[PDB]
């Protein structure tokens, strides 16, 4: 039904507008496995991530047809939806590159 | 595995 | 865009 086109290691943060603080998505510090999933029937994409130790879902966010994906640093990327700002702090420069090009691909095919 | 797509 | 996080934040 739906395919994982990439798997990077990153710390998923969401932004706390109230306090100008980046907070760990899910409330708990640590790395997660972050996927970009492709629903082959619908041609729709979403970012899904489960923390490495707990297998708790810390992020599950649709990728819309025009998402502005900002690569702030070579290891920190961020994008915005109607509610939050999501950040991925990747474990490696390479993790970020493959995730970034899967994201850039997903936006071209949407 | 991924959650239901909500 | 918020600034990237302090390494103390992560």
């Amino acid at each position: 039904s739906e395919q994982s086109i990439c798997q990077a290691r990153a710390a998923v943060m969401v932004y706390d507008d109230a306090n100008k603080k980046w907070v760990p998505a899910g409330g708990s510090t640590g790395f997660s496995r972050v996927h970009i999933y492709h629903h082959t029937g619908n041609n729709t994409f979403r970012v899904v991530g489960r923390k490495i130790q707990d297998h708790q879902v810390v992020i599950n966010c649709a990728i819309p047809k025009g998402l502005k994906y900002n690569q702030a640093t070579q290891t920190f990327h961020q994008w915005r939806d109607a509610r939050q700002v999501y950040g991925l702090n990747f474990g490696s420069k390479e993790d970020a590159n493959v995730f970034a090009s899967a994201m850039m691909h997903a936006l071209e095919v949407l | 595995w991924p959650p239901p797509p909500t």
Side-chain angles (χ1 to χ4, degrees), chain A residues 37 46 48 50 57 60, chain B residues 2-6:
Chain A
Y37 277 96
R46 72 191 163 136
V48 173
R50 308 190 166 246
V57 175
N60 171 27
Chain B
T6 46

Side-chain angles (χ1 to χ4, degrees), chain A residues 25-66 68-82 84-93:
Chain A
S28 287
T29 297
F31 275 97
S32 310
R33 212 168 212 93
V34 191
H35 302 241
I36 301 187
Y37 277 96
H38 182 218
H39 198 281
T40 38
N42 303 339
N43 191 40
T44 62
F45 294 78
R46 72 191 163 136
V47 174
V48 173
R50 308 190 166 246
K51 200 150 189 242
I52 295 304
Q53 95 166 248
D54 56 2
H55 303 145
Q56 163 206 15
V57 175
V58 301
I59 181 176
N60 171 27
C61 170
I63 300 164
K65 173 181 70 173
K68 187 180 291 180
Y69 186 77
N70 170 227
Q71 299 172 231
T73 76
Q74 300 176 9
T75 51
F76 183 78
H77 300 174
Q78 60 188 346
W79 71 89
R80 62 181 35 122
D81 67 7
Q84 275 148 342
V85 193
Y86 303 102
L88 301 181
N89 194 236
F90 296 99
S92 82
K93 300 150 296 322

